[PDB]
Design a protein around this ligand. Structure first.
Ligand code: NAG
Ligand code: MG
Lengths: 48, 51, 249, 215, 702
């Protein structure tokens, strides 16, 4: 803003895991030519 | 510091927060503040000393 | 704030048995923080080495020490490292202790007076001891310098229990020697916080850090002179006010 | 069938694995199984028994490595309760490390090596960052000779090459290979293999990666 | 002599305390001043510098929104969603990996107080001698060994101060040693309900609740107050009532204690030492307490007072029963800014006498309890924390807002033990429900002919009568339009009669609306059994109301009107219904000289085109509440009208009126105009009709 950006109001990346998403999922969508589709959402980590 | 902009020059400020468990040149009253310039599509290195 | 000289680096690379990367040549002097050299071989009988100049292009206070590291390509865990600094011996940072644990002393020596200032900030909820002492002896050494003092009366006692006639030890860094300007057989009044205690029961010691305040006190015969007569009655009233009334907090 | 999430661990971490059970026709079944964990020497450290009824045939488990533990190769051995004659096994490693930042690939132009070529053997070096951008640095390459449980290093074949945009070329000639061994007759070399080792360093002196191709 | 000009705070007000030597800011609910709340004037005439957590000076006084803390770490799990900061009334859901088990709460939300609602979520495997401690929200944990004789350490982020144990050790049985830390900030206070609940739960044990003693056992209570220059209120006024209430409550359990009273400003002063043979009865100690005076001409020396207590308990061979006695020490310190020595070593030596921590097979841990109460905005949390005791499943440090809250807490404690007879009490436990928080509201649903649904609210005045707004209910409504919902159940109940105000009417003047006397009552023939989730409400100018205001019975109804409705902006609340749940909303009522100003904008209401006299339909009994005076506060709803109006004071809820209508329709845009004002019926004016119709139930109406 009116003040040049100093180092007081910035958050820092912290999460650095090595393996995640150890979940289990089930398919029960009504069939369509024998192919069931499920939609899931995931939140990415803080690594590059 | 990694810069990956095709046509740009950056002048950035770098700070290292202090910690009672370490000893460095940064005390409670005064803290490290460095000003550096990064060439485009490049990297820069800054060293720090710790006890 | 330090940089190598391009001409000397070029001359060194032009020599044999040493190799400098082609990329580092198009690295105009402004950005030359780190340098890397490849050595073909090192003798195991004599010392073969080099040297080069360093220029300064920027003025910065409290300059950090440098670093030099050397190792072999296949084995990385076996390496040698060294430090250096112009005004500091062996590049090691300043710290004072005895073989187990310690803080460091990269700080100042003192803070820097009117009557009301002394009245008010001697009642902070942080300060612990307020004494007046007579300096009995001084001893200089290598790691720090020590003073032995005698206590006349406990104006405001703290956690440590002392009685009149005991002796106390004060530790200080060398850089404060010119700052304090202490001499034999003189009276001072002093107060400090509680974080400065060092050692343990019973060989407690005090540290003259930034927050501790020490002031000279004239001899009793010269409070009739206006040099510090005002301060003489000011501190007398301050002492009797703490002894009789205390402090309004 | 046994699945583990990772391949190499550090002390103080945790190990998570799964077991799948199938019959001859490769369909889910439910029976009783037993699982043992074996240290490098061979003496079991922890054993357990489980049943996989009413789960469609997936068993998740867990273990927690201590802080003061040995190093090397550890084994997991599982078998059915009915027939202890047949066992199934899996391996993993325990060794402290720090995660790298880029990958190195070494490859020749021809898998074989005809002994009558005058160009020797040529290999190429390709290094790349993890997120897709290219890399620069310097590489050291060395060769070797592999016989049945035996390795011989040729000290004369050690080269330094600058890697720019992730591309380096190394060439080995007949003379060095012939002089490295005491066999003037070329036809005696048939039946012995070669391998190459490379090391890549950056221009900032920050990382160190090693890659090896054998056989 | 300090510069008192230019100390205005944006969005709030400020007050001067202790005759120009202190200044204190204030902003409405949902905001907090930055970065300090109270400033003091030093001797030099210079205003004190702004002391933050890290001395962050600002050039203007403003108050900002309340931010709930952001989670730091979570091991073996995942939570949704993520944001840099969480506003008020936001939700977080936890869910963790396969092959583990989750204990605690899965959905957590943070309310206006500043704390997340529920417990801590812990995902565990089940392969250790002693169980997972878990990460409290906001902290960070070091240590990952869960076998015998290991330790775990906690610490949290910047700008936060810890409250609890620093290191925890896995004991022999399988339980940890200490309490679960949860670090707080400056602006979170504790309300009287939780303080009373925690104090009672820690002091006694359950079976009702009775105190447990070994045979030939005894208790020794030591109360330590301070008289330094922090309040200067007459001669220890206010504390006397709290001490008397505590003595009575303790003696009510049929136990024989021995008391001791000390007072310290710079030197200790004993009043009733335990060694006296007359210090074992309540009357004598109360008489001795009722003669405390003042002697100051300042300072603070906690070490000397604690050493005096030590000398009091010291024995000069020990007598019989020293192995079967209990010691309780209550410290009412608002300061603890020590000047003359730290007080930790005294506690260490005191517990060294009793042979507590000097064994491994006989810990003997529960034979010494220390409670600390803190008052005001100058409390130093870190010093308070290190002095009290620390045990699991209990809380031993309390911090309140002001001096009134102490007597509030003790009055609530002394009133909790009463039967279900009294009016308007609320007692919420840790696992309560929505209806437990509001045990009085009832709902009536009607299908009016030639119209859709009609939902209205009401309060349970007594076991026979139900009060509801007369707009909802008309004379032509039959039993098909009479459905009651009380006790938290959908079950209906048969009625006896309905009563309307004789002067209630709705009828060429250009104003087809006439809300005069919007009072309706339903009279039953059924007795209700008072329980947990259902409770009545308490009405003004009644013997019970006088007994529920901590006043002598000489107060008149006019004096009660003045006290409950002074000529000032007065806090009040209405329990609105949102998202199929009930939640309270705060409002400010203006019965002062600004009542005319609040009513000066009544012409903006629709259908008020031909208002000849502004008060011809806006009767003087109307009360104008809500609006933008002085802050933009949401008003009530036309489609949700019917509910009662409740004022909250002395930890008690008192009926004041029934909602009538609002100026404009803006509530239906839920998915606030300045001129939007709420008009309500004052119940003081309708007193004669209720008095003439309430002479049978005998509820002490006077
Ligand atoms: C307390 O008295 C003595 C210690 O002097 C001890 O023998 C006795 O058993 C103790 N009483 C208990 C533990 O109830
Ligand atoms: Mg005080």
């Amino acid at each position: 803003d009116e003040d040049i950006i100093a180092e007081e109001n910035i958050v820092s990346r912290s999460e650095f895991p090595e393996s995640w998403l150890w979940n289990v999922e089930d398919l029960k969508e009504p069939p369509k030519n024998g192919i069931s589709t499920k939609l899931m959402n995931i939140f990415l980590k803080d690594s590059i | 510091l990694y810069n990956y902009r095709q046509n740009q020059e950056l002048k950035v400020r770098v700070e290292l927060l202090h910690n009672p468990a370490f000893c460095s040149l940064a005390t409670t009253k005064r803290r490290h503040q460095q000003t550096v310039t990064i060439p485009p599509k490049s990297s820069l290195s800054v060293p720090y000393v710790i006890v | 704030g330090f940089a190598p000289d391009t001409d000397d680096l070029k001359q060194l690379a032009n020599g044999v048995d040493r190799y400098i990367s082609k990329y580092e040549l198009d690295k105009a002097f402004s950005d030359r923080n780190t340098l890397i050299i490849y050595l073909d071989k090192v003798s195991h009988s004599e010392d073969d080495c080099l040297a080069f100049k360093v220029h300064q292009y920027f003025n910065v206070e409290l300059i950090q020490p440098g670093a030099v590291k050397v190792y072999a390509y296949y084995n990385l865990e076996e390496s040698c490292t060294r430090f250096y600094h112009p005004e500091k011996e062996d590049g090691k940072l300043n710290k004072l202790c005895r073989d187990e644990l310690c803080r460091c002393a990269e700080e100042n020596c003192f803070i820097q007076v009117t009557l009301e200032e002394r009245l008010d900030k001697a009642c902070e909820p942080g300060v612990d001891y307020v004494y007046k002492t007579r300096l009995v002896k001084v001893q200089l050494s290598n790691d720090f310098d020590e003073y032995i003092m005698a206590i006349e009366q406990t104006i405001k006692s703290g956690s440590d229990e002392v009685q009149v006639g005991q002796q106390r030890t004060f530790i200080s860094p060398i850089k404060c020697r010119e700052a304090l300007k202490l001499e034999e057989k003189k009276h001072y009044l002093m107060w400090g916080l509680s974080s400065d205690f060092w050692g343990e029961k019973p060989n407690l010691s005090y540290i003259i850090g930034k927050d501790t305040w020490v002031e000279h006190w004239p001899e009793e015969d010269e409070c009739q002179d206006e040099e510090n007569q005002k301060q003489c009655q000011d501190l007398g009233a301050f002492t009797e006010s703490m002894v009789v009334f205390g402090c309004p907090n | 069938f046994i699945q583990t999430d990772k391949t190499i661990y550090t002390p103080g971490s945790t190990v998570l694995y799964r077991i799948f059970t199938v019959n001859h026709k490769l369909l889910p079944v439910g029976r009783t199984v037993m699982v043992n964990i074996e240290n490098p020497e061979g003496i079991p450290v922890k054993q357990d028994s489980l049943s996989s009824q009413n789960q469609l045939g997936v068993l998740p488990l867990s273990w927690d490595i201590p802080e003061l533990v040995n190093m090397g190769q550890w084994k997991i051995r599982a078998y059915y309760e009915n027939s202890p004659q047949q066992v199934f096994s899996t391996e993993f490693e325990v060794k402290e490390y720090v995660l790298p930042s880029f990958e190195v690939i070494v490859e020749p132009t021809e898998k074989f090596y005809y002994i009558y070529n005058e160009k020797g053997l040529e290999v190429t070096i390709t290094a790349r960052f993890l997120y897709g951008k290219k890399v620069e640095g310097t590489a050291f390459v060395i060769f070797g000779i592999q016989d049945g449980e035996q390795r011989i290093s040729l000290p004369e074949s050690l080269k330094r090459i600058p890697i720019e945009d992730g591309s380096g070329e190394v060439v080995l000639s007949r003379k060095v290979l012939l002089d490295g061994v005491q066999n003037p007759r070329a036809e005696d070399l048939v039946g012995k293999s070669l391998y190459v080792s490379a090391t890549v360093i950056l221009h900032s002196g920050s990382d160190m990666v090693q890659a090896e191709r054998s056989g | 002599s300090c510069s008192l000009e230019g100390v205005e705070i944006k969005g709030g007000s400020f007050r001067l305390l202790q005759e120009g030597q202190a200044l204190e800011y204030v902003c409405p609910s949902g905001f907090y001043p930055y970065p300090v709340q109270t400033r003091t004037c030093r001797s030099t005439g210079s205003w004190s510098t702004l002391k933050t957590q890290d001395q962050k000076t600002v050039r203007k006084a403003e108050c900002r929104a309340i931010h709930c803390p952001r989670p730091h770490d979570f091991e073996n799990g995942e939570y949704w969603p993520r944001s840099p900061y969480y506003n008020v009334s936001d939700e977080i859901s936890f869910h963790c990996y396969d092959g583990y088990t989750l204990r605690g709460s899965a959905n957590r939300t943070c309310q206006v107080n500043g704390r997340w609602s529920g417990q801590t979520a812990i995902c565990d495997n089940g392969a250790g001698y002693c169980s997972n401690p878990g990460i409290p929200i906001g902290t960070r944990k070091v240590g990952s060994q869960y076998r015998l004789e290991d330790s775990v350490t906690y610490h949290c982020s910047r700008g936060l101060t810890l409250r609890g144990s620093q290191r925890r050790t896995c004991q022999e049985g399988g339980s940890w040693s200490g309490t679960e830390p949860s670090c707080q900030d400056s602006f979170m206070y504790d309300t009287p309900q939780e303080v009373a609940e925690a104090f009672l739960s820690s002091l006694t044990e359950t079976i009702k609740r009775k105190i447990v003693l070994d045979p030939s056992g005894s208790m020794n209570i030591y109360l330590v107050l301070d008289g330094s220059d922090s309040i200067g209120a007459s001669n220890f006024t206010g504390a006397k009532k709290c001490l008397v209430n505590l003595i009575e409550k303790v003696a009510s359990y049929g136990v024989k204690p021995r008391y001791g009273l000390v007072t310290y400003a710079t030197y200790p002063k004993i009043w009733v030492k335990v060694s006296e043979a007359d210090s074992s009865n309540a009357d004598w100690v109360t008489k001795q307490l009722n003669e405390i005076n003042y002697e100051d001409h300042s300072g603070t020396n906690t070490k000397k007072a604690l050493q005096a207590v030590y000398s009091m308990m010291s024995w000069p061979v020990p007598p019989e029963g020293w192995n079967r006695t209990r010691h309780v020490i209550i410290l009412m310190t608002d300061g603890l800014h020590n000047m003359g020595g730290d007080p930790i070593t005294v506690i260490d030596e005191i517990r060294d006498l009793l042979y507590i921590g000097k064994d491994r097979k006989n810990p003997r841990e529960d034979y010494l309890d220390v409670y600390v109460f803190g008052v005001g905005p100058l409390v130093n949390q870190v010093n308070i924390n290190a002095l009290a005791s620390k045990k699991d499943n209990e809380q031993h440090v309390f911090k309140v807002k002001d001096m009134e809250n102490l007597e509030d807490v003790f009055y609530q404690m002394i009133d909790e033990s009463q039967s279900l007879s009294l009016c308007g009490m609320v007692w919420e436990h840790r696992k309560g429900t929505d209806y437990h928080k509001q045990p009085w509201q009832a709902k009536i649903s009607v299908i009016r002919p030639s119209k859709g649904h009609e939902s209205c609210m009401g309060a349970v005045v007594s076991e026979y009568f139900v009060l509801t707004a007369a707009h909802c209910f008309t004379v032509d409504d039959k039993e098909h339009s009479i459905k009651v919902s009380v006790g938290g159940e959908k079950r209906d109940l048969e009625i006896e009669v309905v009563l309307f105000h004789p002067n209630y009417n709705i009828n060429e003047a250009g104003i087809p609306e006439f809300y005069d006397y919007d009072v309706a009552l339903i009279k039953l023939k059924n007795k209700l059994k008072y329980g947990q989730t259902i409770r009545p409400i308490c009405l003004p100018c009644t013997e019970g109301t006088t007994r529920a205001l901590r006043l002598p019975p000489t107060t008149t109804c006019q004096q009660q009107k003045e006290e409950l409705l002074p000529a000032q902006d007065i806090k009040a609340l209405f329990v609105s219904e949102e998202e199929k749940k009930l939640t309270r909303k705060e409002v400010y009522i203006k019965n002062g000289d600004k009542k005319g100003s609040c009513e000066r904008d009544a012409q903006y209401a629709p259908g008020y085109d031909k208002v000849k006299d502004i008060s011809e339909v806006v009767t003087p009994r109307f009360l104008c509440t809500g609006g933008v005076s002085p802050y933009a506060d949401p008003n009530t709803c036309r489609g949700d009208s019917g509910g009662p109006l409740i004022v909250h004071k002395r930890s008690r809820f008192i009926q004041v009126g029934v909602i009538s209508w609002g100026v404009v329709d803006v509530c239906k845009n839920q998915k606030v105009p300045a001129h939007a004002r709420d008009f309500h019926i004052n119940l003081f004016q309708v007193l004669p009709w209720l008095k003439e119709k309430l002479q049978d139930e005998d509820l002490g109406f006077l």
